[PDB]
């Protein structure tokens, strides 16, 4: 099957540079155009570039032209996006994609069918800080949860009882605090009878600061 | 360059409704328009390519039409899992510009939130700050008002809200409101309460606690 595996995301200084990779399986990239698309927080999808690797032809959105360089290495079956002179407005999730073509009367009928998993680029001078995890103590049905406060950059993941608890879980979007640090809560509703018997643990992970916390939430 | 204009910007439609999203090109783009569906924070999904052609695997209820300048994505019978932002893209003439998108939300019956208040943990208080957390769970519509009262006194701009995407089976929302104070100001007062106003609620619902159980 087809797979596009991205890598190289992260945090960088305004003015700084960074290289995304998009490694492909199940097809040859030389005969297809590989595309980069990105989504800034609370904005539409924005196409940024393409490369036709067989010959090395490229094209760029005006918004990125003169700063980013798209390229490919046919023998490594991988495409790249070198991004320079980065700005706050470049902060986004960057996806790579393949344009599939089908033969309709000699010309391509196509679109972007296979996509990488998307990799977050944050452009900012702030330092990476790991979160603190605080319990939201409970008390029919009871709400409890845990509060993941003061981290940078995005993202955090939250799972419950090591993958056993999923129903009734709500992990909220992160909010940018006035302090410049993110925070979020994950909550769950459980049967009110279990509170004294089942232990509830939130598994928080913040890969950017390699912080991994597992927090018990018990009645006070 | 070529510009793609979608309509409407957004819409709300009931499960079972026919949904029509329009997409216009500034110049003739033949039939080289595609339609994409994007679930929040996830890779978009190719629904339709070349105006009318269905990508293998895509449910038959999605279809497209048009050529030249005017294109339309039709969802014959809207299902709960279909909320997303839908984008058209033209690939006749480089650069292949996206339309603004069209956010589809699922309209459904009114439902009240179960409200819950949470006091700040002992752990946090040591750090010098206190977060008080109000939860509104599984409600519809999205419009809701949350007010904080510390010893019956209305609070200004010391709280923030986050909301979940629609639930993919029951189309409800959940909402967190977080009230942030210094430890000192928290330890000066007794009674913390969030007042929730919402259409599903006949009158406001207030959940409260006194500091130190």
């Amino acid at each position: 099957e087809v797979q596009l595996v991205e890598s190289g995301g992260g945090l960088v200084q305004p003015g700084g540079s960074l290289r995304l990779s998009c490694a492909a399986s199940g097809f040859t990239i030389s005969s297809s155009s590989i595309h980069w698309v990105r989504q800034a927080p609370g904005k539409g999808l924005e196409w940024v570039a393409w490369v036709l690797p067989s010959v090395g032809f490229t094209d760029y959105a005006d918004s990125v032209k003169g700063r980013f360089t798209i390229s490919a290495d046919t023998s490594k079956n991988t495409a790249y996006l070198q991004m320079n002179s980065l700005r706050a407005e470049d902060t986004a999730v960057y996806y790579c994609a393949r344009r599939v073509c089908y033969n309709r009367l000699g010309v391509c009928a196509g679109g972007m069918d296979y996509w990488g998993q998307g990799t977050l680029v944050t452009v900012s001078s702030a330092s990476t800080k790991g979160p603190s995890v605080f319990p939201l103590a409970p008390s029919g049905t009871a709400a409890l949860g845990c509060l993941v406060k003061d981290y940078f950059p995005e993202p955090v993941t939250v799972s419950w009882n090591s993958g056993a608890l999923t129903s009734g879980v709500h992990t909220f979007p992160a909010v940018l605090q006035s302090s410049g640090l993110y925070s979020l809560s994950s909550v769950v509703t459980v049967p009110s009878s279990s509170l004294g018997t089942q232990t509830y643990i939130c598994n928080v992970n913040h890969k950017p600061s390699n912080t991994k916390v597992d927090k018990k939430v018990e009645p006070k | 360059d070529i510009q793609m204009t979608q309509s409407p910007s957004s819409l709300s439609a009931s499960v079972g409704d026919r949904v029509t999203i329009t997409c216009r090109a500034s110049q003739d783009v033949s039939t080289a328009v595609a339609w994409y569906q994007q679930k929040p924070g996830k890779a978009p999904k190719l629904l339709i390519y070349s105006a009318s052609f269905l990508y293998s695997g895509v449910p038959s209820r999605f279809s497209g039409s048009g050529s030249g300048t005017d294109f339309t994505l039709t969802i014959s019978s809207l299902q709960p899992e279909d909320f997303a932002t839908y984008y058209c893209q033209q690939s006749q003439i480089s650069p292949p510009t996206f339309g603004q998108g069209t956010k589809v939300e699922i309209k459904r019956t009114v439902a009240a939130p179960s409200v819950f208040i949470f006091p700040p943990s002992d752990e946090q208080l040591k750090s010098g700050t206190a977060s008080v957390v109000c939860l509104l769970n599984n409600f519809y519509p999205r419009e809701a008002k949350v007010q904080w009262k510390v010893d019956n006194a209305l609070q200004s701009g010391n709280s923030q809200e986050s909301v979940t995407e629609q639930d993919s089976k029951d189309s409800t929302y959940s909402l967190s409101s977080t009230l942030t104070l210094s430890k000192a100001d928290y330890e000066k007062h007794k009674v913390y309460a969030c007042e929730v106003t919402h259409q599903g609620l006949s009158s406001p619902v207030t959940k409260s606690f006194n500091r130190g159980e």
């Binding site: 005969s31 297809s32 036709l52 073509c101 089908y102 010309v107 391509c108 | 480089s94």
Partner: peptide
Amino acid sequence: APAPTPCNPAECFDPLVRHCVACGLLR
């Protein structure tokens, strides 16, 4: 004006890229 280079079997012409590319079966 200049007619594009003819695509071999297995390829077809993609106007987006102004070049021949792989092209599968249309269904």
